[PDB]
Amino acid sequence: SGFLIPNAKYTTTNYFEFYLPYYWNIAPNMDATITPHYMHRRGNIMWENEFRYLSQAGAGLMELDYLPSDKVYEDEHPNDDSSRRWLFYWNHSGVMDQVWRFNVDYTKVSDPSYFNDFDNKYGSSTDGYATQKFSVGYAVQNFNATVSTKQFQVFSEQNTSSYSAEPQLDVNYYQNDVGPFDTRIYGQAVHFVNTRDDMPEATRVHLEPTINLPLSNNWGSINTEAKFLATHYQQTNLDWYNSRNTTKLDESVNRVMPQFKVDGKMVFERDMEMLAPGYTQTLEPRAQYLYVPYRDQSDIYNYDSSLLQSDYSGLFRDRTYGGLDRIASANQVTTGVTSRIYDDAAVERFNISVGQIYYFTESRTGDDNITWENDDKTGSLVWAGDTYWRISERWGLRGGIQYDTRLDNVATSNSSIEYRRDEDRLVQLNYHYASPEYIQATLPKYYSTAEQYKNGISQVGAVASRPIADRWSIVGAYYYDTNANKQADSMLGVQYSSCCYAIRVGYERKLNGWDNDKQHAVYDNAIGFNIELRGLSSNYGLGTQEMLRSNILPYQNTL
Amino acid sequence: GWHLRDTTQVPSTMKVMILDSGDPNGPLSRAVRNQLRLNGVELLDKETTRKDVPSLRLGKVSIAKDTASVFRNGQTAEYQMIMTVNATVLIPGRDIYPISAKVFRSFFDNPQMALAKDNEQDMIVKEMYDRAAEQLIRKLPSIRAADIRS
Amino acid sequence: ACWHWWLEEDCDKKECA
Ligand SMILES: CCCCCCCCCCCCO[C@@H]1O[C@H](CO)[C@@H](O[C@H]2O[C@H](CO)[C@@H](O)[C@H](O)[C@H]2O)[C@H](O)[C@H]1O
Ligand SMILES: CCCCCCCCCCCCO[C@@H]1O[C@H](CO)[C@@H](O[C@H]2O[C@H](CO)[C@@H](O)[C@H](O)[C@H]2O)[C@H](O)[C@H]1O
Ligand SMILES: CCCCCCCCCCCCO[C@@H]1O[C@H](CO)[C@@H](O[C@H]2O[C@H](CO)[C@@H](O)[C@H](O)[C@H]2O)[C@H](O)[C@H]1O
Ligand SMILES: *CC(=O)N1CN(C(=O)C*)CN(C(=O)C*)C1
């Protein structure tokens, strides 16, 4: 236990700042780090305390940041009583005695502009809200029961009201040998309460009994699943919503509704010889009929249901929305097909997948607040396609396209190509696109109104990392938005690694915020150095992946 | 020249097998147990009296959720969810063969219905384990090819 | 009034109470 090497950086938000670590072993499995952070523009010292523990309940990390005073928060907020800043973070995860599960994910800030001002270690400036979760569960092989508490704090100053589950109880029971049928049951009891006092609160009790018959062969499979959904709502604090909306929520809502689903998966093979001998191509059709009756949910507030994104494996879901408030009607068939190419060692080299949903009736739920650019209701409306090609042991490419006929445009698309020799040598190109029609559909009205959200997503990203002489590592990343012809992110990093020490110099220019006065984006720079000690262990890495995680758009490996 | 799959997805020497993990009541072990139940595979209890039976040891789970695109103000637009699953197959005369499974999923962030979005994220977690289990099934008989070439 | 639990579809509220 002692002082580490103090280390400095220069940002445009804090000007020149430095860290002075001190490390402490309380007892082995418990350590702590107390770090003064002197920042010059804010003109004070933030005290950053980390405390990591390992116990029988699991492994956890606690973080406490305290800035006693702020000149800048006194400048752009003169009317507040104090300019103090604080962060509290708690991440706990563990399984005790193989049946008890404890998970804590807690993050509370003093002010909604915290992560735009300070360092991004356990949060990010990209984050729009902070999470506060507790969950305790008991899980054995045929039964699980989890109680949880989910509270969120929203950073955006348009509407800070967000609902919370205080508490939520989930019960699952399974029994897979009732004749030829497999049965399961899922129950949920959840109390929804909002931060504002004029917004209506609820208590949901849900039961879901389910039977299914699976049959399988060497070449195909079929699965028939029958399901009930019983839901009781008790809704209170209903006066303010009913005083200003045309439709009326009721205080006691019963919703009992079936679900019938037939799934069928079909497999063909072929020995393909025109590419190479021994290669095998499998063609896999898949079909699905789903029928869900229509019940009117206009008398139910939307607390925890959001519209689900429909990829190729997301085509075959039995739920249009997540959660349990909005369950859309279904009279649909989903048809998809997947071609796979295996090599002579039965290792999968290529796959391509393309599918569609045909709707016989309109998927309606009682209220239709999502807008569409045309009135297409039935027919082939949603198309999806995925691809993955492993070109060699070093190359790989992924692709995904999602088209909606109701948007009259491709909804989302992504692609990536990656060359990778080892841990240290890599090039990756990636592309992301989301249409502004789908932004107008699945996101609320000020996103389609305000200029920083209404253009959709079209970014090209280039990541590279290269060593020199097995002691220098150079890392670069460039993410660029092609709609505005403006950059989103830049990152550079040069690290010299020796036998007992390592020096890392990092640079990042990032999108951080938006200026509401002059209507343009806000960029911040950061140049910094880190010195760490080697030789105490077998860590002879060049630090490439620790530099690849250091920006607001991280590296992930796509082979 | 297409033809029906006359063979099996799981090899015939892995028709009876032992499922081992460091968390047997987890969602991964439940997904792998379900996916071996759909292929007719008989599963034995851990530390059974039956020897020369091949084994599946499930390793650790890496779930990551990171920012994949930003808006013009730098707030997140796309959340990329990553699942990495490691496992080893013990053929108890021959060899230990390691396999992996990595699952890519993707969803928008919406703060204003954020609790809704997080239930969405839980549903995505409930899918990914299942998909990861399928990829482990799709890496069963290459080991059988590696059971011949060795 | 006019409640459904089985596979019959719900209908619109301006003709039924
Ligand atoms: C998870 C378990 C869910 C259990 C809840 C569902 C159980 C099935 C409903 C039977 C409830 C007994 O309730 C009896 O039947 C119906 C159906 O709700 C009620 O009728 C109700 O209709 C609707 C609710 O959808 C509302 O207008 C109102 O709350 C009430 O009129 C009757 O007023 C009552 O006599
Ligand atoms: C078959 C399944 C496998 C397919 C794999 C997926 C491949 C995806 C390719 C990567 C995406 C390329 O990007 C694709 O082209 C352009 C932008 O370049 C977008 O196209 C859109 O924007 C451009 C200009 O912004 C205009 O022509 C128009 O408004 C619209 O077509 C597509 O909607 C997108 O899908
Ligand atoms: C394949 C991987 C590629 C790796 C290489 C990519 C990373 C290389 C670094 C790119 C960043 C340099 O990009 C350049 O940054 C400077 C930083 O002063 C910006 O310059 C900026 O200066 C100041 C900020 O101090 C602002 O007032 C000004 O409006 C802005 O122009 C430039 O507008 C941008 O063109
Ligand atoms: C109570 C009920 O279900 N119905 C069926 N009808 C529909 O229009 C759906 C006819 N009807 C009324 O118009 C009141 C009664």
Author numbering:
A (entry chain A): 226 to 784
B (entry chain B): 1000 to 1149
C (entry chain C): 1 to 17
From the paper:
LPS biogenesis systems are essential in most Gram-negative bacteria, with LptDE responsible for the delivery of LPS to the outer leaflet of the OM. The outer-membrane associated β-barrel is made up of 26 antiparallel β-strands (β1−β26). These β-strands are connected by turns on the periplasmic side and extended loops on the extracellular face that fold over the lumen of the barrel and require rearrangement to allow LPS molecules to reach the external surface. LptE is tightly bound in the LptD β-barrel.
